[PDB]
Amino acid sequence: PLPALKLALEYIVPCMNKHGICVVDDFLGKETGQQIGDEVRALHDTGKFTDGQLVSQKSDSSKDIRGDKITWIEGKEPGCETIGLLMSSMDDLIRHCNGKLGSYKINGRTKAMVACYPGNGTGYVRHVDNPNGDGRCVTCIYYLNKDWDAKVSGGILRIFPEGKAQFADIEPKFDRLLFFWSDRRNPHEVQPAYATRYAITVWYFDADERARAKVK
């Protein structure tokens, strides 16, 4: 459903409230997805990303292993127009969920974090996005890896939902949109990536949790 409204009301709200996780495929379409892919790859090739999260040292600094590289995008930067549009689509979508996602009242968003795992076997250890109540209630991730083959490239996002035995494996599939509670209900990890892996994350703020963040 293109109008975010039907998708938000008939799928996203119900899914988030029952599962705390929601997967939406073919969110923007091939044409738009590829345009974002192209903008993200230009950022990388023009050196706009960091050098990567320091994974290992071992006192010889050229034997230092670095992982995910990142860059923060506000949405208006020249050359990042399609990303700004993606961001606007996530926003319109969240706006349609107002008063429906838990008992939260979203009133803000972080800038978009574009992450690129180099594909050198690095990943992201199990973690909780917001474990100390910093205001972030919902994590939103947009994937842009065409023909991703987890069986050969790894890089699967594994979420250990609620506090129930199983976990949920989600492939960083092209044009896929993902939503999940940012707090302790969703510990998760990015398994080792053996191929270049791109994703765009945005975190939405709950009005109350954020307002008291400096005093909690």
Ligand SMILES: O=C(O)CNC(=O)c1nc(Cl)c2ccccc2c1O
């Ligand atoms: O930029 C601002 O208005 C103040 N920033 C924040 O409130 C803020 N808080 C958090 Cl927890 C994050 C967390 C990640 C990235 C950006 C953040 C951010 O801008």
Ligand SMILES: O=C(O)CNC(=O)c1nc(Cl)c2ccccc2c1O
């Ligand atoms: O990309 C994915 O499928 C899942 N990614 C994450 O869970 C993730 N989380 C955090 Cl908090 C960061 C934080 C910084 C850079 C990358 C991150 C990341 O990829």
Ligand SMILES: [Fe+2]
């Ligand atoms: Fe995360």
